[PDB]
Write an enzyme that holds these catalytic residues in place. Sequence first.
Site, PDB file in Angstrom:
ATOM      1  N   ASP A   1       0.019   5.222   0.794  1.00 30.62           N
ATOM      2  CA  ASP A   1      -0.173   6.253   1.852  1.00 30.62           C
ATOM      3  C   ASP A   1      -0.172   5.560   3.209  1.00 30.62           C
ATOM      4  OD1 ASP A   1      -0.558   9.041   2.648  1.00 30.62           O
ATOM      5  OD2 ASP A   1      -2.569   8.397   3.328  1.00 30.62           O
TER       6      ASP A   1
ATOM      7  N   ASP B   1       0.879  -1.193   0.000  1.00 30.62           N
ATOM      8  CA  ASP B   1       0.000   0.000   0.000  1.00 30.62           C
ATOM      9  C   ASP B   1       0.908   1.232   0.000  1.00 30.62           C
ATOM     10  OD1 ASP B   1      -2.272   1.664   0.256  1.00 30.62           O
ATOM     11  OD2 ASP B   1      -1.637   1.915   2.384  1.00 30.62           O
TER      12      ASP B   1
HETATM   13 MG   LIG Z   1      -3.002   3.408   3.270  1.00 30.88          MG
END
Ligand SMILES: [Mg+2]
Lengths: 243, 244
Positions: free
Chosen positions: A10, A8
């Site tokens: 962010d 992932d």
């Molecule tokens: Mg995230």
Amino acid sequence: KKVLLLFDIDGTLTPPRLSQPDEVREVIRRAKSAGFTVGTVGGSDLAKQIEQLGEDVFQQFDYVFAENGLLAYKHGKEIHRQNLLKELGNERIVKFVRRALRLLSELDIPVQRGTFIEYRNGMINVCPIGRNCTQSERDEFEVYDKEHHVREKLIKELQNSFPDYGLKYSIGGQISFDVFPVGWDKSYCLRFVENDFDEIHFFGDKTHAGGNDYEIYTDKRIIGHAVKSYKDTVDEVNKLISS
Amino acid sequence: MKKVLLLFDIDGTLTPPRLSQPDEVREVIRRAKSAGFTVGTVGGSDLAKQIEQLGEDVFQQFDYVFAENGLLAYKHGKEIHRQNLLKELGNERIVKFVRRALRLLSELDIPVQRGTFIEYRNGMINVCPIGRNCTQSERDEFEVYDKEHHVREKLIKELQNSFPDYGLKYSIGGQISFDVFPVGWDKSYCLRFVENDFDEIHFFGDKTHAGGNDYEIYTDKRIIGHAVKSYKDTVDEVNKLISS
Ligand SMILES: [Mg+2]
Ligand SMILES: [Mg+2]
């Protein structure tokens, strides 16, 4: 032995809403030198990954999965581009967007601008303030939405209108939510790698049920690593490099 | 000894309809600059659309690049002007406007809708009933549909009825959209940046008839107007100026 590491972005490769730190670039460089394949899986568009990771993201990562893997690149080459129309059909799309437009017209939020409904490859993005707002207005709406639950109320109204539509609603973003067919969550990207790797590791900060990393984290084909921050990601990748 | 400016609309003036600049047009603009003409573009759409139509080197091709009617202006690839709609209308009117537009778009019965219905730009709002996120085929289909069913023209009538005092102009410029902007922010807006720097200013465009998005600039008393039907007529008309 072929091992894929999927991240992932962010909160996993970055501090929230900021860019990739040097410690993260370092550990990804060192993982690739050990012979790990590395990939990103975000729910946003590609432009957002370029902004968080940098202009050379296609050189940093072997795989870049945008829109949950509905837009997929390998070594900077497009390998997949899904379309929502083939899954939902035109009638359901048009009824959905007409209801979303009516609901957005009924809001009493203080600021609205433009690009409320973004029809991407295999998902619809709904942004109550509109994606054409300033950074200041975006940051303001983020705080407004924590008090007034604008996105959550809109999702509830769309669920009530369209019980059998086969859609997942995901509050992924800062000021928007994502709508996509059931199964077109981040685990979607595993169809492009499942047959090509001995082990697939997933790293993400939103792996709790309700988070947009839950489905990929709990997929029987991957080894999941829940991280609280990019510091945990570095520690976890460092452990795998040791071997 | 005189300074002359040549200003060009883009779609149907520098390009075949909905397609990119032909090498021939690239050549005639180069030949006009060589003859001593200053050249500029004035598009109603965003800058990214001009780059698609003209190429990544548009700021080297043209001395002036006017996007959004000149509400975003460049000279030698440097931004000289960026207007802001919020300072003209204020937040209350923008929010009432876009909520009424959203309501009207929700009440349509058109066969295809997708996404990016309402685009908030620098100094204008673009309203696209099908949504800008449709395919080429869906865009070309809607152009024909709108010629028969007058979707844009009926939305403009409803918005005008809703907001008689907002001081807005409604311009059906695009293939599938219309623009909304303050009165006086039509393509003639760009003339404020050049009117004092040129002895003569020529304008070439295909939509110079009343209701066309080149009408106000074509009919401006500061302008020598050239109504062209195609980029072939633009080549012809610029060739005539070069030859004297
Ligand atoms: Mg995230
Ligand atoms: Mg034109």
